[PDB]
Amino acid sequence: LVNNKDKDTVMGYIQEVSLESFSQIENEILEKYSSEKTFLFCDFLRPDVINEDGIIEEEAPKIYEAIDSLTELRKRCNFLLSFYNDRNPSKKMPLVLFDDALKHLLRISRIIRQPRSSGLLVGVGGSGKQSLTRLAGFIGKNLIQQIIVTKTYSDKDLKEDIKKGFDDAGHLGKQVTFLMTDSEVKKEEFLEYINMVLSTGEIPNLLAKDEREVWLGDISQAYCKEKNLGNIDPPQSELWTYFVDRVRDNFHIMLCFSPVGQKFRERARKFPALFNECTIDWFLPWPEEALVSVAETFIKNFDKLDTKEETKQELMKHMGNVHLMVNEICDEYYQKMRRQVYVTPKSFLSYLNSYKTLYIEKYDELDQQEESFKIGLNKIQEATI
Amino acid sequence: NKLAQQRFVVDMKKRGVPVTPGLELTSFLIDDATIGEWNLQGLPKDDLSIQNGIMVTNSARYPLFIDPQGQGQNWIRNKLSAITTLSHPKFKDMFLKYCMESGLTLIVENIENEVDPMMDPVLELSKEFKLFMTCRLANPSFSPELSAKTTIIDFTVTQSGLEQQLLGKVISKEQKALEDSLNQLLADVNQNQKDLQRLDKNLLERLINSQGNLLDDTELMDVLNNTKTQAKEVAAKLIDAEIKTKEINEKREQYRPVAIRGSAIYFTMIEVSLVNWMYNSSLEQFLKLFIESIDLSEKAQLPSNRVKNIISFLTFHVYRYVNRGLFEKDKITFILMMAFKILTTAGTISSGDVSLFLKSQKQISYLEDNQWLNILALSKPFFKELPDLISRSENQWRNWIDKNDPENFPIPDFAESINQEKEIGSFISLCLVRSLR
């Protein structure tokens, strides 16, 4: 749902209906969960800690549920961020973790984990969905691959990549994920092939080019125990049935589109299954609370020389104000001059970098000059005495 | 500056956090020595180019210029370099690896919103390598994320800098002796600004070279006298600031009207490109035409009279050049725009009155509903003061509206003196002619 007000009314509906059915402990629900305070954040990896007894991954964490808390959530998130840093060379991922970002990672987890699930993610660029999904997939052990558009833009790359994906989620049976975005579409046709992949999963004569039987024959050894026909025998077509079962059970699809432009809406209308099967999630732009949070995360480590109580908090506030404003200036420029202008949180981060760097530079340089103003005071003092 | 500055300072005032009055952004950012060094390297001497050079200097990320004219390409061609195009089979493979493993700086000059995807992951491992790349056609349609990666700078020339550039080029071609005097005194006064800087160095030397026992150095007395001597040459430089700001200025005042006209002409012929594609041309062709016009007819004798002859001849030359490309239905229009863009500066014709001339009944009874639409059109300075009994006399102007060629022989006597003055009386007559007939 697009506007937070729409959210507020559905939660009002929920509270009303909960009171309607729960006509026997209604005051207790009002005290505890119908209250707008945060309640029962459900998660899988935070609640249990590996503890690194003899090996790092000592034991698979309990997986089913977690409780409400924000502190340990962020601490394990930062823990994990350090891990992801040393897993990937040149990760280069200064992800800032604020409350809404934590919730968004939680939602990606909710969809990716589920057997036979997928979720369309919408939001303007810079919302970070493409950045968030990398961690969200690494925690879930899922492999990830993107499509690369060669100098010649064609179709075979898609087919071979999907073949490898199935054979990861089929014969080998590993867990995978797929990260198509607007960069990974060059014409419609890609959308058609993926559409049928969501629906059926059988590519016409990609796997049946005199190969389906050798690959299936490389799998029946698992079938001897998996379906367990008294460890006696099996059949032939039923193996393909189990194969489509496996691949659709472990081929999650993560699509991330733009909300703006021209092509998105009629692309959705072209292919029904796309918006139909997948879950849908919005990412609104960051509100002032998030921005002041980022400002203090970057000013705490940068308040070495800028020491002033009761002015720092107003500083971070005013910096948020500056960002919200350059949004409006962008809008006005496009409105009058019909010339396109955009913005991203990356530029805000770069702006903080410039602030810190040129401030330490000018602080130190001009204060060595002001040290020289004090050397002038020393000259005056020694002359006078 | 304006919008952003008022914007930030109102934020600061509402926030009540303290801030200093006065921007002076360029002054306390870069020492003017490097500014002058760039001005030797072809950086235009005016404000907008100064902030632009700062912006490239900061180099937060690799930049990408909107470049209608080519200031950035020439600047980078000169700034520290003294090249490989995007479209080349060797470029994608060869030029990349050379620059990426030995730092050749790999300039590119043919962005048209179409990116070979291999360009990007190179963008985001020799530690001696940079890269500047720029566009050509104005009004880009860059993707949101192409704004995410690189900084964007607009080098859209303003007319304001344009008249100074044309002023320099006319001072060149009309007689080189003017440039001899110009560059001579200019080098002298630049060096005298550096002599004020040397005075400052002398003060600093006097102040901290000894760093103790300054007073026991009785040579400090000589040092104090030395300070005075340097100020004396500054006084000569001070006198030169007058001798400059009149003499060269009047030598420039003979020509800075011309430059104004030149700039006006250019910003006229820009907009016809938006009227239709294929009416597109550079500044460079215009520069060749301008320099030529000076050569063609400029100098006979009587320099002020030859300034007036500039204003006669240059206009016709550029005018005919553009007409050779124009189409029939656009013939009248280009000349019309030229007239307006001429008068938007000297005569200070209101854009509101221009829109009155472009866009636009109870009182009168004889005239037509097709005509009464026009009465209400004219009705809504003295347009809303003379539709009354003056206009409704109906004595002799009935013949007038009947007469063909209303403007010429049967002139309106509604405002005879206003039509007589003619400084704006033309434009008044024309607002009348359009609204009525």
Ligand SMILES: Nc1ncnc2c1ncn2[C@@H]1O[C@H](COP(=O)(O)OP(=O)(O)O)[C@@H](O)[C@H]1O
């Ligand atoms: N939460 C964040 N904090 C700081 N920078 C971010 C954040 N999210 C995204 N970015 C910046 O935006 C860039 C692109 O992020 P991406 O995941 O592509 O966003 P989107 O998917 O909305 O385009 C990243 O390289 C990163 O520098």
